[PDB]
Amino acid sequence: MKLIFAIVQDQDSNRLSDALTKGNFGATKLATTGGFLKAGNTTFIIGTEDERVEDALAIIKENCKAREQMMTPTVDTYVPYPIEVQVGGATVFVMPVESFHHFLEH
Amino acid sequence: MKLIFAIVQDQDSNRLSDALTKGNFGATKLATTGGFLKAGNTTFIIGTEDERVEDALAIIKENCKAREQMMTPSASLGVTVDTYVPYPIEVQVGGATVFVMPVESFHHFLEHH
Amino acid sequence: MKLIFAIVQDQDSNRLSDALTKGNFGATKLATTGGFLKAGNTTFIIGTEDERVEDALAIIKENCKAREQMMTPTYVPYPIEVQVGGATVFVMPVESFHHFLEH
Ligand SMILES: Nc1ncnc2c1ncn2[C@@H]1O[C@@H]2COP(=O)(O)O[C@H]3[C@@H](O)[C@H](n4cnc5c(N)ncnc54)O[C@@H]3COP(=O)(O)O[C@H]2[C@H]1O
Ligand SMILES: Nc1ncnc2c1ncn2[C@@H]1O[C@@H]2COP(=O)(O)O[C@H]3[C@@H](O)[C@H](n4cnc5c(N)ncnc54)O[C@@H]3COP(=O)(O)O[C@H]2[C@H]1O
Ligand SMILES: Nc1ncnc2c1ncn2[C@@H]1O[C@@H]2COP(=O)(O)O[C@H]3[C@@H](O)[C@H](n4cnc5c(N)ncnc54)O[C@@H]3COP(=O)(O)O[C@H]2[C@H]1O
Ligand SMILES: Nc1ncnc2c1ncn2[C@@H]1O[C@@H]2COP(=O)(O)O[C@H]3[C@@H](O)[C@H](n4cnc5c(N)ncnc54)O[C@@H]3COP(=O)(O)O[C@H]2[C@H]1O
């Protein structure tokens, strides 16, 4: 089993989430911020069997888009130039799981 | 050492945190949402020595209970002038979903000025 | 590749973020809560190449400081402290890494 951490842009979050659900993947969503832009993005945690990892990755790839994102921004004052930063569709880490439990006690 | 990621219901979050502390397990948590119900839940990150893993899992099992949760009803627009309350759709939610991950190395940095 | 989870105090978060960037490391941050003090802190997730793990750990150690924090709850008691570390750090193995760049 593997635990996938996928850091995606907020604009793709809902589409990805719906696609993972359609593909019968469980997932948990975390609100995160990037080290460089210091702005909101989204991290998904997706646990799955080894044999289904490439399927999950394909869903991520197909639902996330690389974009340019704007970064939060003399005698004479000038209007500052926007700062446009390349942001990938997804940064993904696939981690090994030692054991899984689903506790259903009442 | 292992690093446990446990996704639990909000209703159990305070009770689990208290039980971990009483059991001398460290823990960090964060508010998360579920991909299916799109509702708030909590994710715990609990680092533990190998000897203690079964004790940590026991605490999680004991303090995190399965419940039925309502699915948010359809937001589809009607014409009737009303608040419409359809049959509830109840969804099973487990006590905890838990991933135990192997740790390669551990550091606790205590530098001052 | 390895994936570092580093739990640091909020007052070190911006400095750490900047030092990682200066060191050519990527990072993601989670706003978290500690179990014992029940107070806000920051969890960094920093993925890096095997051979650079010790360099990332150095940046973390260098930029995060241990601080004393007071315990809180008919009176304000004689203060009792705990020493919050600069960082609690777990280095985790990564089976695979992907960076999807389709637009
Ligand atoms: N000097 C520099 N240092 C770092 N980034 C710079 C940069 N100059 C430009 N960039 C760009 O800034 C984008 C957003 O970085 P941010 O840290 O906010 O948001 C990141 C961060 O949240 C996460 N991420 C990327 N690398 C990571 C890593 N090694 N560990 C953990 N999270 C990472 O994925 C998000 C998107 O990363 P991506 O590389 O696609 O997109 C990056 C990168 O292309
Ligand atoms: N009873 C047992 N059951 C299963 N495995 C065992 C074990 N005793 C030793 N090991 C294995 O040997 C490693 C070194 O144990 P040690 O006791 O020298 O070094 C231990 C111990 O000195 C320390 N430690 C601190 N507080 C502890 C506590 N409450 N319980 C267990 N270990 C603790 O944490 C160190 C690292 O623990 P970690 O599990 O990463 O690494 C452990 C574990 O992989
Ligand atoms: N078609 C469907 N797809 C997904 N779930 C459906 C479903 N039909 C019913 N369910 C139920 O919805 C419950 C809540 O899922 P949610 O994704 O909001 O909240 C989840 C999610 O936050 C997390 N989780 C579950 N499996 C996951 C995985 N493989 N990876 C990451 N997080 C997971 O644990 C929470 C509770 O999960 P649990 O399985 O006990 O409980 C699930 C499951 O029993
Ligand atoms: N049972 C106990 N008795 C006496 N003193 C205790 C105690 N548990 C914690 N402390 C003290 O309280 C400080 C803050 O812990 P807290 O859980 O709020 O904040 C923690 C928590 O967010 C995280 N952390 C610590 N151990 C962890 C673990 N095993 N798993 C996950 N996160 C951990 O790192 C933060 C800083 O931990 P650090 O150890 O440097 O600093 C700790 C330690 O000085």
Author numbering:
A (entry chain B): 1 to 73, 80 to 112
B (entry chain A): 1 to 113
C (entry chain C): 1 to 73, 83 to 112
Give the authors' words:
Here, we report the crystal structures of PstA from L. monocytogenes (LmPstA) bound to c-di-AMP and in the apo form. On the basis of these observations, we conclude that PstA is related to the larger PII protein superfamily, but has diverged through evolution to specifically recognize the bacterial second messenger c-di-AMP and thus is structurally and functionally distinct from the canonical PII proteins. The structure of each LmPstA monomer is composed of a four-stranded antiparallel β-sheet packed against two α-helices on one face. In the LmPstA trimer, the β-sheet of the three monomers form the core, and the α-helices are on the periphery.
We cocrystallized LmPstA with c-di-AMP and determined the structure of the complex at 1.6 Å resolution by the molecular replacement method. Three c-di-AMP molecules are bound to symmetrically equivalent locations on the LmPstA homotrimer, located in the inter-subunit cleft between β1 and β4, and the T/B-loops of one monomer and α1, β2–β3, and β5 of a neighboring monomer. The adenine base of the first nucleotide of c-di-AMP is recognized specifically by LmPstA, through hydrogen-bonds between its N1 and N6 atoms with the main chain amide and carbonyl of Gly47 (at the end of β3), respectively. The phosphate group is hydrogen-bonded to the side chain His108 (β5) and the main chain amide of Gly94 (B-loop of neighboring molecule). In contrast the recognition of the second nucleotide of the c-di-AMP molecule is mediated by unique structural features in PstA, due primarily to the significant structural differences in the T-loop which forms a part of the inter-subunit cleft where the ligand binds. Instead, the T-loop in PstA forms a shorter, more structured loop with a conserved 34-GGFL-37 sequence in the turn. The main chain amides of Gly35, Phe36, and Leu37 have hydrogen-bonding interactions with the phosphate group of this nucleotide. The side chain of Phe36 is π-stacked against one face of the adenine, while its other face is exposed to the solvent. In comparison, the adenine base for the second nucleotide in two of the c-di-AMPs assumes a syn conformation while the third one has an anti conformation. In both conformations, the adenine base is π-stacked against the Phe36 side chain.
